[PDB]
Design a protein around this ligand. Structure first.
Ligand SMILES: CC(=O)N[C@@H]1[C@@H](O)[C@H](O)[C@@H](CO)O[C@H]1O
Ligand SMILES: CC(=O)N[C@@H]1[C@@H](O)[C@H](O)[C@@H](CO)O[C@H]1O
Ligand SMILES: *[C@@H]1O[C@H](CO)[C@@H](O)[C@H](O)[C@H]1NC(C)=O
Ligand SMILES: *[C@@H]1O[C@H](CO)[C@@H](O)[C@H](O)[C@H]1NC(C)=O
Lengths: 24, 24
């Protein structure tokens, strides 16, 4: 959800979805 | 002031002003 995750830059080895987030 | 607070998402039970912040 929004206000459950934080919007950041990348880091060491994040996991790619090859999608877009459902969070509006 | 700007650079005195942090712009975030919500959290558990923040306080509503029903106004807008004076911070430009
Ligand atoms: C850019 C980078 O650091 N890639 C590493 C990769 O070399 C390693 O094999 C893998 C192991 O899960 O973790 C990630
Ligand atoms: C959504 C949520 O957790 N709301 C709680 C509420 O149930 C509780 O009565 C109040 C006490 O100050 O704190 C807040
Ligand atoms: C995501 O897309 C990239 C680019 O095509 C691909 O190399 C990678 O394997 C994909 N990863 C997953 C988990 O689908
Ligand atoms: C803020 O506005 C909401 C929506 O009208 C209202 O339910 C709430 O009581 C108000 N809170 C304060 C502190 O004015």
């Amino acid at each position: 959800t929004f206000a459950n995750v934080i919007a950041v830059s990348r880091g060491a080895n994040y996991t790619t979805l090859n999608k877009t987030f459902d969070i509006p």
